């Protein structure tokens with residue numbers, strides 16, 4: 001009886017094994033655009049992915065992780081609200097059964113078809129496992145997906161998914177360039193929060209981009225053909241792998257833009 005997104009093991013259940021699920025800085029949240037204040041002290045975000053080395057794509061039974069070589073400072077996130085250097089370790093998505101839902105964060109209660117999380121760890125903690133025990137351990141770059149035109153830079157991810165259908169399957173995924181997943185603008189909202197899956201650790205500076213990327217119906221349909229289950233178990237389609245918005249509590253969302 002492990003955690004997941006079903007009726008019996010979904011986000012409403014998680015607090016029994018992970019009491020921090022009801023903590024003071026949980027993610028995701030609704031971003032109220034009329035309450036988020038412009039902060040002129042916020043520096044521009046620095047996304048340096050030119051030397052990023054992708055290695056592998058993994059179905060972990062909850063999502064798929066594209067994993068990077070984080071053994072040196074190649075692909076890093078700096079600037080914006082961050083102190084120091086955060087190393088890219090993996091990206092994954094959250095998505096829905098239909099285009100009207102799937103994002104974790106919401107904008108004035110609007111749900112997007114999906115949400116990309118680029119996960120980075122603070123190098124002053126030496127390793128990812130140490131970093132998740134610190135309030136400033138992780139920086140997650142959040143990007144909304146809407147359905148329209150295809151994203152060229154996503155198609156290499158879409159075409160490998162046939163080969164990692166079921167939990168525990170992985171495939172070689174070298175030379176993927178995550179710069180292909182960004183929008184034009186790096187305008188963002190920022191707030192302190194958590195991982196959005198167990199163990200729901202309160203270690204994340206959230207950086208959520210204002211501009212969504214467009215992906216095609218055909219691109220998101222191929223995300224929805226993945227399986228939560230392992231090989232030769234009953235098919236459960238990998239859909240609605242999103243946690244809903246959590247109480248903001250004593251937190252301010254800052255905007256990088258006027």
Ligand SMILES: O=C(Cc1nnn[nH]1)NCCc1ccccc1
Nearest residue numbers: 117132140194195196197198199
């Ligand atoms: O990838 C995600 C999903 C997610 N969290 N926040 N947004 N998405 N979480 C990390 C899961 C994890 C944390 C610590 C140790 C082992 C594994």
Ligand SMILES: [Zn+2]
Nearest residue numbers: 092094117196
């Ligand atoms: Zn995520």
